[PDB]
Design a protein around this nucleic acid. Structure first.
Ligand SMILES: [Mg+2]
Ligand SMILES: [Mg+2]
Ligand SMILES: [Zn+2]
Lengths: 24, 155, 60, 78, 117, 98, 127
RNA sequence: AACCCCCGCCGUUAGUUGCCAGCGGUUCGGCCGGGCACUCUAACGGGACUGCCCGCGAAAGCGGGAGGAAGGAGGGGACGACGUCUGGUCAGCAUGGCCCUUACGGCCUGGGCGACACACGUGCUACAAUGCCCACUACAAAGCGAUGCCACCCGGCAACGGGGAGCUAAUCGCAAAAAGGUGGGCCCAGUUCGGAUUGGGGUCUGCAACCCGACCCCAUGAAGCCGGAAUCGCUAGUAAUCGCGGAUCA
């Protein structure tokens, strides 16, 4: 889901990282 | 085009069995340009073939597509201002095209969950003489002999 | 309000969030490239003239 | 959000401080709908502008954490 | 088992079972399991009686949930209502709180399309 | 030991000034690595043609910013005077460091 | 001694350092059957080896870089061809007709302006 | 048409990019020495001309084949004639005439282009098992960055904050390309599909986020189970599909 505000590609499409997406 | 006939696209032969017809089937299965995915999905069914019957997936594939090969079809055409459903022989390429195509659809018609098993069971019924894609073939050929009256315009 | 505005754009009296971009040549409100500091319109005009060094016709 | 030091105008606090310095009226035509309502400012009446005119919006306990603009219409029929 | 007072997410993943609980979701589901040492894979259909009261009572008394949570949601709206903040008036007419495109869609709150013209 | 940078636009003018230095340094001193071209950083600017509305047929330019590197080893006094006097640059902003 | 050839396709280059021996094929480290996993084009890149009738008799070492995963495979395909033909002129008389010596001019084209994808134009309309 | 630019085959020129291809050492990272063959980086030139062989023809040319990386304009770009549409733009600018001049000019605060009982256009995200989630792993190009790009360390679930090295930058950095690949959970459900709406709490920019920004974490989990009449795209690395960058700019 490229639209889920809580998923892998969820932030990837939004150009962000956050919790569910690994970040330094 | 109005000028040239435009030559067919000679596709790459099978990379496992050695046959262009097989690879063409992978292309019909290919969704969103994922050959390697569709390829495996095809070979998955190939193994499902040997699971059910001790028959080689190669000839099991030929038998299926052969029994789903539409011998004739009706085509629309104008004459002074009227459309006649004129039937006649199909081109060998188009026959191969429709056959491979219908099978892919017939698999989609099945309730089976995984795609491989759908392709598997469908290829069985097709090679047999009765299946979702096969009946659609039987249907089209009926239309031909049905409108055989208008077959006077062979063109 | 065209003249008084181009003058106000160079004023920057209050906070920095008012020193918006403003083309120099024909003094356009928008489409102002920061590099050239010009608007897209006067940009192409000069480019054709050759008054823009290193700015050649792009082709690929 | 302005978590570090709640945002608000000086003349707002200044004008309202003299109102608590002796307990005057409440009339105060403001122009900063961007500010946050001060807690102890309960019981006053800020005439908040909104392009059209000064709205005599009262104040109380519940209305505090919100802006001054929250309680002032900027459009007709709303 | 009747977990959240009345809710009964039986026969399924324990973590997902808590998602059906009002006020509890995917995150708060994992949190309960990591605070009670429960495997997300195991079903509610086959758990210990101790684990029942264990996990149930935990999440139950811990944070807000159920209709009493939903009561607080409307409660705040009664507050945006008693005076009429820009946020509240949007709940009055049914408009969105984000002041989005009303000139177009926003049918989510405006209901079905009432053509009428 | 020494390293020279030759940034500039026109590669035709860059080629003349770069080759010039190569002859001057080698023909009057120790060894010198020839002109070393680097990945040319280009500023591709796209934009519309018409003044009003025309989201098509748009025209675009590009800023060719070339790069050429040349390294001289042994600091020869002859090469220093040669490059200090016999030079013919123009639109070629050079930068040299040890 | 060695058989070298240059591979390239979709800006995916691939050096081909071949050395007659067993069949151990290393490419950018790792193993061939190791790097390419679950791909049928893998065994297809070794096609030039099956044409020469010497599958298991050569130790390969390719340095493929850039481009996509598959572009590398096609790079290795043509690369191996130039390698074995380098020390074999007669093998060109049977590798060429089979179609191998070609950079495959097929390459992605520039996305044209006004359009969306170099060809696909936005939905035409009139309403 | 042809001359100029990009991508294709190769070479010459230059070797701090890359390279045990060659050899030795190596905290095995092409790190050291060392080397320019290779890849690449651009710079110049070569090559393809129906040139050659066969068939047709009066010719131009067409057809089939070899050689070749590539054949009959190789793929792509830029190039859009006389004129046409009382076509567009006095709001880019130039500009005849017209009209205002304690205001048809100028500054400020706040509001407004964001207003919504409705309709059309171009789009994005889905309706899911060729599929969705978690962990681990691998291959791009192009472009951009000194009061800007931030390695990496500590903290927080997080956005992000405190400290702090490199970098006028093929040498440091955005930076993890994604899809794919391996193993695992899901078992057809308004669903672990779908992410709109809404409650509570937080971070960054900026004087200032009610109107009216953006992004986080918890909860909320709406319509829609592939769409009437009708209708659009493109003939090969194309359609479809999956990612990254740039201008713009706090
Ligand atoms: Mg070369
Ligand atoms: Mg909460
Ligand atoms: Zn301007």
């Amino acid at each position: 889901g490229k639209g889920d505000r809580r998923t892998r590609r969820g932030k990837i499409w939004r150009g962000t990282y956050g919790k569910y997406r690994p970040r330094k | 085009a109005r000028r040239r006939r435009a030559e067919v696209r000679q596709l790459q032969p099978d990379l496992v069995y050695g046959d262009v017809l097989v690879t063409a089937f992978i292309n019909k299965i290919m969704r969103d340009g994922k050959k390697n995915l569709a390829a495996r999905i095809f070979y998955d069914a190939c193994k499902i073939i040997q699971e059910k019957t001790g028959q080689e997936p190669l000839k099991v594939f030929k038998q299926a597509v052969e029994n789903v090969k539409p011998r004739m079809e009706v085509r629309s055409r104008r004459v002074g201002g009227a459309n006649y459903q004129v039937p006649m022989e199909v081109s060998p390429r188009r026959q191969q095209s429709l056959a491979l195509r219908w099978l892919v659809q017939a698999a989609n018609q099945r309730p089976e969950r995984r795609a491989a098993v759908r392709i598997a069971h469908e290829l069985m019924d097709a090679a047999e003489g009765k299946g979702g894609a096969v009946k659609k073939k039987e249907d089209v050929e009926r239309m031909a002999e049905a409108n055989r009256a208008y077959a006077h315009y062979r063109w | 309000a065209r003249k008084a505005l181009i003058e106000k754009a160079k004023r920057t009296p209050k906070f920095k969030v008012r020193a918006y971009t403003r083309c120099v040549r024909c003094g356009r409100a928008r489409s102002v490239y920061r590099f050239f500091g010009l608007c897209r319109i006067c940009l192409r005009e000069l480019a054709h003239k050759g008054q823009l060094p290193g700015v050649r016709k792009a082709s690929w | 959000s302005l978590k570090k030091g709640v945002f608000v105008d000086d003349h707002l606090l200044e004008k309202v401080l003299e109102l608590n310095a002796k307990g005057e009226k409440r009339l105060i035509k403001t122009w900063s709908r961007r500010s946050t309502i001060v807690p102890e400012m309960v019981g006053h009446t800020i005439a908040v502008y909104n392009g059209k005119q000064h709205v005599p919006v009262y104040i109380t306990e519940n209305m505090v954490g919100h802006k001054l603009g929250e309680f002032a219409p900027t459009r007709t029929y709303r | 088992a009747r977990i959240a007072g009345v809710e009964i997410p039986r026969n399924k993943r324990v973590d997902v079972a808590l998602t059906y609980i009002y006020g509890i979701g995917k995150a708060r589901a994992k949190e309960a399991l990591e605070k009670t040492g429960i495997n997300p894979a195991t079903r509610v259909k086959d758990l210990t009686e101790a684990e029942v009261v264990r996990l149930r009572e935990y999440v139950e008394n811990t944070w807000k949930l159920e209709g009493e949570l939903r009561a607080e949601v409307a409660a705040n709206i009664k507050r945006l209502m008693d005076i009429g903040c820009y946020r509240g008036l949007r709940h009055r007419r049914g408009l969105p709180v984000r002041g989005q495109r009303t000139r177009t869609n926003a049918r989510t709150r405006k209901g079905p399309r009432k053509t009428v013209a | 030991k020494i390293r020279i940078k030759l940034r500039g636009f026109d590669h035709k003018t860059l080629d003349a000034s770069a080759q010039k230095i190569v002859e001057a340094a080698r023909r009057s001193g120790a060894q010198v690595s020839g002109p070393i071209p680097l990945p040319t950083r280009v500023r591709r600017f796209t934009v519309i043609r018409g003044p009003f509305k025309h989201k098509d047929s748009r025209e675009h330019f590009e800023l060719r910013t070339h790069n050429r590197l040349v390294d001289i080893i042994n600091p020869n006094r002859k090469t220093i005077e040669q490059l200090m006097t016999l030079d013919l640059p123009t639109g070629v902003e050079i930068e040299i460091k040890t | 001694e060695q058989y070298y050839g240059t591979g390239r396709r979709k800006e995916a280059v691939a050096r081909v350092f071949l050395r007659p021996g067993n069949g151990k094929v290393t490419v950018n480290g790792q193993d061939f059957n190791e790097y390419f996993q679950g791909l049928v084009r893998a065994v297809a890149a070794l096609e030039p080896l099956r044409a020469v009738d010497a599958l298991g008799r050569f130790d390969a070492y390719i340095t493929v870089r850039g481009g996509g995963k598959s572009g590398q495979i096609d790079a290795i395909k043509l690369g191996i061809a130039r390698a074995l033909v380098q020390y074999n002129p007669d093998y060109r008389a049977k590798l060429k007709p089979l179609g191998f010596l070609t950079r495959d001019a097929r390459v992605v084209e520039r996305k044209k302006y006004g359009k969306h994808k170099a060809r696909r134009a936005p939905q035409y309309s009139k309403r």
